[PDB]
Amino acid sequence: VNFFDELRIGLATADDIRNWSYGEVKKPETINYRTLKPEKDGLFCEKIFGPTRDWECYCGKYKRVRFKGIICERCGVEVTRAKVRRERMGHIELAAPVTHIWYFKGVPSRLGYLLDLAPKDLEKIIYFAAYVITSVDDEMRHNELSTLEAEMAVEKKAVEDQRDADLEARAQKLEADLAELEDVRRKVRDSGEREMRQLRDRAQRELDRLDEIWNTFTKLAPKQLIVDEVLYRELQDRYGEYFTGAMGAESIKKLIENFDIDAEAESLREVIRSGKGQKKLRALKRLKVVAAFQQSGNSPMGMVLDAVPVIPPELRPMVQLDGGRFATSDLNDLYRRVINRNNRLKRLIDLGAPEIIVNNEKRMLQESVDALFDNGRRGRPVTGPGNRPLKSLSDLLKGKQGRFRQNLLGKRVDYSGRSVIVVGPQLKLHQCGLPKLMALELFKPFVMKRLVDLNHAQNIKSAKRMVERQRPQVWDVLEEVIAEHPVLLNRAPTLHRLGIQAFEPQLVEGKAIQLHPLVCEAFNADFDGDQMAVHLPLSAEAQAEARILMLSSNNILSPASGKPLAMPRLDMVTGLYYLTTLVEGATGEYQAATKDAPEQGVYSSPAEAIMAMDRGALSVRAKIKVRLTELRPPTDLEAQLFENGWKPGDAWTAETTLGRVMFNELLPKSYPFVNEQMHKKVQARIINDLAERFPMIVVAQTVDKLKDAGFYWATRSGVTVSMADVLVPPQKQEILERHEAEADAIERKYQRGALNHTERNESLVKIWQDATEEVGKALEEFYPADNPIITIVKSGATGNLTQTRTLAGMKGLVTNPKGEFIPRPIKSSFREGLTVLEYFINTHGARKGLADTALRTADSGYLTRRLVDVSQDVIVREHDCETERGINVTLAERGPDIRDAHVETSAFARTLATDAVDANGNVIIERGHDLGDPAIDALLAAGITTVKVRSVLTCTSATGVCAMCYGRSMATGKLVDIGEAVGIVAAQSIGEPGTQLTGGLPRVQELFEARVPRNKAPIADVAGRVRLEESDKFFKITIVPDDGGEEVVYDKLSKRQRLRVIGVLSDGDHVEVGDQLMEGAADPHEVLRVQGPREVQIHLVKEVQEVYRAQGVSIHDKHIEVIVRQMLRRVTIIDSGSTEFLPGSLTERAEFEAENRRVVAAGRPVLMGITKASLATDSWLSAASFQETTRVLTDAAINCRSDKLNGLKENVIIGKLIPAGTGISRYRNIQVQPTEEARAAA
């Protein structure tokens, strides 16, 4: 079936635990040391759990598969599958009831908040250090109080009679002794007086005990503890029928039996109303756990265990190693300790033992079960060999090695390989090369199927043997089998969505995976030993998902900026750069000769030009005039020539390079001419234009032709490095030594005594940085264009002017491991070679860099993990919820009388919120347009300096988001689809380029975790005019308000924080409530409380994009906005509460709004950390999987909350199809019937 909509929890009642169990274990024995067989009515027992070998009983009478569902009369074992040994749960009947440690030792205690007592006192009750009173019959005590009071008065009169009698009996004896006696007498007198004083003290203590017993008897009630033990020993025999008490868990069971949840829950709702203040908070902390038990179908009786369950043996396995020695699990020892003490307790009950040994054995049992459920929680942990704490049942679930975490989120997989990747530039983008010896095994069943389909193999086994042996016939079939049966290639670490991609596996001879060169950026995979993992998607649905969603051709555009990630890089770039770049004074050049000769550099066809090239006559990079037919001309030359008919086979003249024609020959038919050198940016905008204008297959193919051509022309580029090719600037002697003359001089100033070492140390850095800059410039003035080093960098293929400067000229200043720059620079090129010292100083920054990039990946991985686990639930649920709300994007602020640099990140690929009204009101565009450049330039032309766009930030959808509010999806390039997990896309998109940073990832994780900044720069609380008084190395800023209230004053902020540049902030200026005061980082919490959610929603995006914008990465805002949304979807409650809501809790906005109406509450906006927001979820499985499994499982179990599985990270854990992409009902239950018009003829 595999279809369960929801998942409910609760507390396991002894009845349900018995109903679960098939047999009762009743001996403390695991396996026989001699024969190594399971023991009868013990642990691992076949009778209760299941058979050791598949279809085999214990004794060995029934061992045939033919019969099933019969119990063998001798042993009592049922003959079924062995797998049941990892299913059929067991149980243990505890002679005395035992409470669960989770509802007791939990903080706060659930039993403790239910029954209202101190945990230190509750400890004493459970661990048999105190009696507690269960049920007092007050009426029968009250009715017959006076008789017992009279009996008490007689019992006082008795001890008074004894008291006076013994004193009288002593006094006469002392008087007689002194009389017979008359230092020697006074001593005996004093001794007598001391003895009669002790006899008086005894009577006083006895009377005190009686009076105390009477007081404690008059003051009786349920849930009352006794410390003395002898008082309860006395109160047991006399006045025993009027009340009842006990010690242990049975007492708590008897207290739960004598309990009414409704009255207790009701009273608690009044006691909160009566005493408002601190005790209301305690009564309200008490309320929540009690209130939960009302609506819960399960009764709180199940909080105490009469019987305890027993985990399937296979999950606590005792397997013999290759030798004999046991590597046993700890659970076995705990279960042994429990069943031992249970058997001993039952034997003590059978014997009829005294109370002390029974209570001690019950304490031991209680401690054993407590240790079994949670080891090292109460006092010391249980240890076996060599003082190591025993792995408990709860220790399976908790920790980084927990079931929830380790053994549910990352598993090993079948129909999957791994190998080393090599380049495969012969392959088309969608193709990948697979090593035949891998492929053969990887498709073994698929090829076996076709080998049995064909008359190659007689039967399956011969096909299995044939493919196992690697016979010649398999290879003719394996391509027929692999024909369009795609494979998912992965490169760990799997940062972003395209880090997995599907490919057509082409067979290759070797033991390497021939990857495509373009997808290397989509994997971030070098060929420097980096492995990849092949997975064979088996299901038709999987095969489809691979083919449509994640086939590398179909997703050229990154899910980040919607830029083509599968674009040419490294060689291809220099290839096409050389191919297309123009050169003066070349072969077969356009001359335009006068009088005598013709123009020469003019050719009838690209064919002619190719023939003129291949034969030594024409140079590819020559400004020739070619007459083209197949190609479309430039936009200006379209108008001037044809402007009516098109050019399928017409003719027009172009003054280009053969290479530009051979380039445009690669680009699609109806794409116009470029006539430009193909810089990686030019390629980027070209393939972007292809992406936005043309279908994705056209892009996939054209970029592959660009790859093939690019590589072909990379060879005949002539990009090769030599000691001759790498030059030095001839002024490097002059410019450097001059910058010595300025430095040495400072020394001549220092030796006299004017400037200090620290200012000198900086001025040096300035001078030698200027020296580095001079060389950095001067290099490019000298270096020729065709120079391979210049080709590699100025193409944009790879490398920077920095790297070229540190290769040729000088590395300049290099940094210490602190961060400070060394004043003596590397005054020598890597070409010249560093001096041992200059090198040794260089080592610092490089090792520091390696140490930083070693750290960066794991931190980025953790950031990615948090950003995934916060926005794991954010999918596109519906198309349109329809809301006028949005955000106002800048888009050309006042001018030209202008385009913003960050339009592509902020505005582009989004739906419009409002109808684009202008001064006149001739609405050029309505709400809900995808915002292509036409729209942006049309709105710039229209004359508006702000546009309102629909955001996830302001989406009115309850579950997930609506498609329209998100915008045009980057992956597709169309309107986002109505199941996309934009949350995880965004998460990964933000998470991936953390590795490409250097402030940086700290600022990112600090901003996303929503913590207080390292530089707490305050904001303006009220709008007004600034006035700043400069104190003893301190700033006193006072803001005089415009409205008419109290002026905002600050005192103690550091002098090196610096004021904001708005020229610069000084006395005589007016500052806004919105703006920051000093340079650094504005506290989000501060911005939220002052300027509401919408401003901080922009602030987060602005302050978390600036780092990517600075570190040269481009993410689209919407991705961040899916996180910044998931942050601001909670409220902190101040007072009132209404429906048992706590003051200073974290409650969801939509469900809070539903309560807030109160038809027949005070909550403020809160900004919480992504970890806190990921912790704050309704689905108990996800919260349990994230962190603190015990805390949340205990909190949930008592509440008996039913998980809807609306989130997907739970659907992953339970292993059901995820609510996203191709697992939502409207997709996964699509009924496709073939059309009657098609079915008619057939």
Partner: protein
Amino acid sequence: PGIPESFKVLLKELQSLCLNVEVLSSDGAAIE
């Protein structure tokens, strides 16, 4: 694909931790 052993083990683990976890849809309750 029915249900993973990685779910069954968690189910049985939580049943062994005495947390009465039970599977049920909108109409009708399921069996383990």
